[PDB]
Amino acid sequence: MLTTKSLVERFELEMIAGEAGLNKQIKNTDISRPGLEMAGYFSHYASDRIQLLGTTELSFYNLLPDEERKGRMRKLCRPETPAIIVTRDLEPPEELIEAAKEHETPLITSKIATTQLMSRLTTFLEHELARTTSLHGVLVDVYGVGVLITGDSGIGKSETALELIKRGHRLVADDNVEIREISKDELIGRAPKLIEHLLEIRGLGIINVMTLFGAGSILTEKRLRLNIHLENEETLRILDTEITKKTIPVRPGRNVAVIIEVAAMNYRLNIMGINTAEEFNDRLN
Amino acid sequence: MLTTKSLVERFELEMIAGEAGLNKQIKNTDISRPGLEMAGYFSHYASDRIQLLGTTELSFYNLLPDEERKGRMRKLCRPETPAIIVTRDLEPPEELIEAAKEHETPLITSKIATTQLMSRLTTFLEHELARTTSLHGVLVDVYGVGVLITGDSGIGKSETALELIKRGHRLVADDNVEIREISKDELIGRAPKLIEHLLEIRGLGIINVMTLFGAGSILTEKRLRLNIHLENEETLRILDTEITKKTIPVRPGRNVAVIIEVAAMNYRLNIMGINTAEEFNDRLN
Amino acid sequence: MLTTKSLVERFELEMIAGEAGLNKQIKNTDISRPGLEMAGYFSHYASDRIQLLGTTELSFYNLLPDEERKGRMRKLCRPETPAIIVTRDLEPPEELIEAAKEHETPLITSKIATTQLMSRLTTFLEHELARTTSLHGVLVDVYGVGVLITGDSGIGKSETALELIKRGHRLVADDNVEIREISKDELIGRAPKLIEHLLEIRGLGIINVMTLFGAGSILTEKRLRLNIHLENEETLRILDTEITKKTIPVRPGRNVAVIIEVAAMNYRLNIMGINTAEEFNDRLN
């Protein structure tokens, strides 16, 4: 499971005490700012979240009489609390360091503004606790657009991806695609480490695009944005997010790769708010 | 209908008199030089044509005695006569200006040589009185050759045109093509103003080539020269003119766009008088 | 048949005597260095081969007493012997010149080292006595790889070759290919002089690639290395040599020309000792 040790490693956080508590789990992405706790109000809710002590919390705490503040830092270090981070380069109170050691609660110092750090921490947490799955298809980057090509076996997915590569686009994954929903509506795809840089074509066998075309033809990971479904305003649902989908009929008399290129171009255009299907719908009136 | 007003507007002709006659119709493209009329010989034939008075006509007229010339300019201004143009920057006779006002015959002065003006006027007239029709297919400019792509629905006409556009060629019209036979064997095609710059592709929908590819990918009008008929020394007759036609079978294992490009190249070559089908026919002997 | 006259012409060899013997046949590619003959030992074996007299032979011959050497040069000039070449710019013995004239044995002087000349002569001989045949298919040079495209009629061989030409590759022969096995595992292909530079495409007819695309699109001859068999570690046997073969299925949804390009690239890679099918076979373990 995800533990504070992973957090400290990703951001190279400065540990001050509570090293024995680095094996504590971080169950959610939510973050807590225990201001009310500084005033003596404690509760179970949010106790298992990372706690951030910034100017708001410490400016109040430091105005407390010693007899009133007594035990509040200790009560903050509950067993389930994965970490307490003193932000804005503030000095952690001696009582807190003491409590962190006694209760083995990871205590960290950060020089970052509280709000900014909170955003960075939660983003990492969402990335780590990302729902994951795998999909059959080919992931390619076309004009900066992550395109997932799907369709029945033999339809020409890998052959079309090869032509796209030949045309200057990048391969991310062939056959199987590992997908991670690292945040709301953000799907990141990558090839299994085993078939990285590989593309298999009936008749030719397995080829290495990196070896054949160089570094400019590959990309380790890419956010999915467009599903091109090859077949003999729709969408494709993957996990909890839906991405634009275009179903292109395959028949002689056309270059599927070109269609995909234009679909990616049209997509970026639509993203800018420009939609030709509407432009004409109005021109008709 | 076509009236003298349209003529004066197109060439910004200098009107001297007969403004009330600008609503007179110009029925044909033929032009008249009334020399015999200067000698007193009048007839119905050609009276409804634009009349040009150049050096030949006026040098004779100006040698006439006043009593003999009397009424000849008036008899020139017949009701059906749409316009009288004094060319070569010559001075229109007072009698002519007078007659033009009395009979409301548009009187124009031009500084151009009679023969040259005649050619320019008739060319405009043929353009205006051009026979017109519409055709299903896609018109593209490939290596300067106006190519009309035809073939059954779904064969891949628009998809192939899109690939040609992607390859640097220009789109003139998708789906419907307005054709004008502006002169003998000269067919000009253009897209209906409604679908200008548009191309529709099954699966993607309607796209704007101008927005997607820029100005270098479009062309307002183009003379048709080659018909590429996609199918699962021939010609295609359109109105009163026949254009070269090549029937290309569509099947996997080939890039139709490339075939079209070569067909256009071969066409220009044939135009230069070079024909490979003959070159080999001789090499065989 | 192959005669000494052809040999002298190809290398512009310096004839010293025996012109009347230039019509003698050169039956094999083997070459003889008659050292033992200098010592008086003669035999039928190798007598019908070109004979080379270098330092080894002449340094021994010149040490012989006149009575012992008598007749040895004459016995060297057997009727079937097509030619005797004195290499290393050595002086042919008077007795040899005399014998060559008497027996009409072509006598040549060469300034080249014996071993080097032997290699050059035999190479020419193998080229000349090359087994020959003709094959249906299209020969193109793709990234320096001689690719023979085969497959049933209508599959798209010539159309695919045309696309390859359009993509910068070179045409060697369309329809029929003249093959010459000029040495072990070395097959050279060329188009019949009659259809040189020509390519025929259904619908367009016969075109001249040289006229249409210029000199950079043609190649007179090319060694075959890869067979791409279009179909709706294998090899293709031609004469006595086998060349790598890849069978590519043709179906919509793919650009066959691109597949061929990658196959040629993969081939050069495999030649360098790099095989991706193995790279992955190991990565799986």
Curated annotation (Swiss-Prot), chains A, B, C:
Keyword Metal-binding belongs to the record: yes
Region annotation (Important for the catalytic mechanism of both phosphorylation and dephosphorylation) ranges: 199-208
Keywords: ATP-binding, Carbohydrate metabolism, Kinase, Magnesium, Metal-binding, Multifunctional enzyme, Nucleotide-binding, Serine/threonine-protein kinase, Transferase
Annotated GO MF terms: ATP binding; magnesium ion binding; phosphorelay sensor kinase activity; protein serine/threonine kinase activity; protein serine/threonine/tyrosine kinase activity
Keyword Aminoacyl-tRNA synthetase: no
GO biological process, one term: regulation of carbohydrate metabolic process
Similarity remark: Belongs to the HPrK/P family.
The protein's name in its UniProt record: HPr kinase/phosphorylase
